[PDB]
Amino acid sequence: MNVNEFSNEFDVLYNNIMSNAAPGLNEYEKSVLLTKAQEEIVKNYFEPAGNKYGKGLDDSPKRQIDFSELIKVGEGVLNTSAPTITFDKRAKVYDLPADLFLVINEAVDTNAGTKQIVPISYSDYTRLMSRPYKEPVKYQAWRIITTSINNISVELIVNSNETITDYKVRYIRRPAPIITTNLSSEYGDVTINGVSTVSECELNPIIHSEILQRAVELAKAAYQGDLQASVELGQRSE
Amino acid sequence: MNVNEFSNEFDVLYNNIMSNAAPGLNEYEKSVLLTKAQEEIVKNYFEPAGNKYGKGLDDSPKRQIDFSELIKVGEGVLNTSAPTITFDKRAKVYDLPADLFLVINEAVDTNAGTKQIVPISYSDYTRLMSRPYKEPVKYQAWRIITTSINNISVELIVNSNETITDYKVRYIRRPAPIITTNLSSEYGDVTINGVSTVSECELNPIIHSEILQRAVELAKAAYQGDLQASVELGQRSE
Amino acid sequence: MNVNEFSNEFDVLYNNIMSNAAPGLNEYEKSVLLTKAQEEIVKNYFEPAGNKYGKGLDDSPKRQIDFSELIKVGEGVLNTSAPTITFDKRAKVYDLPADLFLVINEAVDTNAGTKQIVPISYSDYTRLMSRPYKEPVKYQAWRIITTSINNISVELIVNSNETITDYKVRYIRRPAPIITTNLSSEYGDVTINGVSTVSECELNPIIHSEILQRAVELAKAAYQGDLQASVELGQRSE
Amino acid sequence: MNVNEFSNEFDVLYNNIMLNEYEKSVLLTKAQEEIVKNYFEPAGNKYGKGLDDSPKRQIDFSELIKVGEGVLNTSAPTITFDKRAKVYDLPADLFLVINEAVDTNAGTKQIVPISYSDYTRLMSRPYKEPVKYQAWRIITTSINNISVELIVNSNETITDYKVRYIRRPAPIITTNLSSEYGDVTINGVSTVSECELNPIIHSEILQRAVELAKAAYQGDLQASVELGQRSE
């Protein structure tokens, strides 16, 4: 469904049938609520505990097809542009793509073959570095986030006497906002995520109805406006 | 039941018998609610936890016959049209049909015979690639979604020294909207999913009554219009 | 009970005894509600979890006699009329009868004798095709629904070097609507399922009273007309 | 209605279906000023409806609504009650303000006419600036004109100040007053003056003038005080 259909069925589901009908929502408000509902839905469906099914990214066909249009593959750029201080002397710093929402798969291609990057926790890092070896298992590499400015910088730890040729990252692209109409105005240009032009929902049509329902629920919680509704509907932001 | 019958029995079940009868619903509103009810019903019945029976796509004769008219078989087109970056060096990119709602069965015919495609999760992918072999079992192939624009693109991983001849996908077609009347108007053409012409329900007649009941429930929740009803009836969007 | 008796006892049970009697229902409304009640009753009684007894199609003498008048035996027509794309290279496409509600028994007569068709699920299909043999057990055949337009098309998989002579389907016929009076009018012909003429209930007289009670309950839920009653009485649509 | 029609149909209503023209002019001018106030305030009239509360009220004030710019009062170096207040003079022919906006470098901002109580309340807090799309306004030392302090947010400059207001009505005069009456003026004009208002409210102005005449000529104190209630 295109943006006009988002807005028309938003109006239908919000106030065109309600008995003591409420004021219609302005297009900026509808775009804001739709973008919020989109992000909430993405976060709810990525995490199993966030939805009533207990199903995350790839726990069912529907969850695969939900994020299928939001998956992207890119590469981390070696961060030798400027000097820096790494926590580990034997780690190579890489910069992830700017439009990164969530990392789901990483791999590094070295001279000793491809290796799956395992994101190790800080307590896990301490445990592993208290051991005599201090290097990954055969077909794996280690990873920790380092000092990041304006984009995520990442330290890749591989086994000794190994060089990294490329660093691929299969991630979830940051969703683009849903903007119903050109938000340009003479009184001031308002933006949802830095863009005023019309922006279609760049995800699969399977969850457009879900985004619409969530947006309507958020609109009605805003209309109710007491602390109660804000608190319970803020639980699903996550 | 054709579209006229959808609308007439919608009117019967909505406001023609109700004591303090409500305003009749316009045909655009009825078409919108019917399309929403259709999608909600499809998602509820595909997933066992979404309905009170706990029965999914093929858990009973009724669930088979429900989606029987919505199943389609097509092929993935090899994506050598333009270059791209694949997460796996040894994966062939294929494009699924545009009108895809849910994938239920995939198979690939290679020079070594037909092989069932197993959609592997990202954590499952990492586990499998940490192993020495890194290839499917005998009569199977692996699959992961890759960078997709305007349609789902898919990476097929098969065993070494194997070529893919065709890639069949048994999926669930995207339901067409239910539109009662030609939505063309002089004041502006409104569309449900990009189509203004009359559109019959293209599913089996077994669930037409179910779609009608769901549409009436959604209409009455819209009429009630408080946050409560929107929140509980948004649970079954799923 | 004929249609006049359906309508007269509908009036008796609806508003002729109720103290603050409601408006009488028009014959189109009574026919619509009776058809809805008929379909609801059929779906409730076919499935054990849908009724309070936990008894399905053949779990008791009453359930047998309920559908006894709605069972039909027909044949699937070989779909060599036009080309198509089958998911399985070794499957023969057949078209089921148009007036099919639910399949309860299938059998195929081959040159190697009669074989019971087992409807295999998609996950079951993947499991079976990951095995070395990939063919049914001795006295059975496999079946999956394929691309269907306007009627269910079915793929029959039998063992190698076997030809199918006929494909019998014992199913439940689609119930005909209950229409009390000729719905022809000068202001517009209204139909329940494409028919305006009088239509008797074509099921056993054992469940006519049940259909009447359900229709009256639906009428009173429509009269009450709030979201509550619609939601709880929509649970038994199923 | 032309002024001749006003004078002639005053005689029909006041002289029992048929006063000096100066006296008629005085009452008609007084009547319109009453009618404008009564139909502006919702509580002043019988319907409980103010300026924009119905289609009739919108056409009533339609020909009085005027849009003008305020001019910076940089000529006189007076003293403002607020540090960041820019003094602006309003139009001379101003009766009632209904919308004010200020065009800053940051953007147009709707001016809120802030009461003396709200100022002390909002200026007793940490930040002490308006909300991001509004400006405050309080009247200041005014000489034969209206001067307003525009308290816009600091770090911003005012480039424009538009005022939408009700223009002061012109007098209704039915004859050249200097012809028979020496130097009498109604609001500084001695010559024939037409009604500058929509014809919809001419009847109510005429009816009010007739009531004012009859109460004035009856001479009873009760009548004078009773009909003086509607003077505001």
Author numbering:
A (entry chain E), B (entry chain E), C (entry chain E): 1 to 238
D (entry chain F): 1 to 18, 25 to 238
Copied sentences from the primary study:
The barrel was reconstructed by imposing C12 symmetry to a resolution of 3.20 Å, and with C6 symmetry to a resolution of 3.30 Å. The barrel is composed of five stacked dodecameric ‘rings’, termed ring 1 (R1, at the portal end) to ring 5 (R5, at the muzzle end). These structures are formed by four paralogous ring proteins: R1, R2 and R3 are encoded by genes gp43, gp40 and gp35, respectively, whereas R4 and R5 are both encoded by gp34. The ring proteins share highly similar folds and consist of two domains, with three structurally conserved α-helices and a β-sandwich domain. The tail hub (TH) proteins form a continuous ‘collar’ around the tail barrel. Each hub assembly is an A2B trimer that consists of two copies of THA (gp38) and one copy of the smaller protein THB (gp39). Each docking hub, in turn, interacts with the trimeric tail fibre protein gp22, accommodating its N-terminal residues 1–26. Unexpectedly, well-defined density at the inner surface of R1 and R2 of the tail barrel corresponds to 12 copies of an additional α-helical segment of the same protein, gp45 (residues 214–245).
Virus ΦcrAss001 (Kehishuvirus primarius) was the first representative of this order to be isolated in pure culture from human faecal samples. Here, we present the characterization of ΦcrAss001 using cryo-electron microscopy (cryo-EM), enabling de novo structure building and elucidation of functions for around 1,440 protein subunits constituting the virion, leading to the identification of a novel ‘crass fold’ in the distal part of the tail. The virion possesses a short non-contractile tail extending approximately 44 nm from an icosahedral capsid. The extended tail barrel formed by widely conserved paralogous ring proteins has a high capacity for storage of cargo proteins alongside the capsid cargo zone, ensuring that the proteins required for the initial stages of crassvirus infection are carried inside virions and delivered to the host cell.
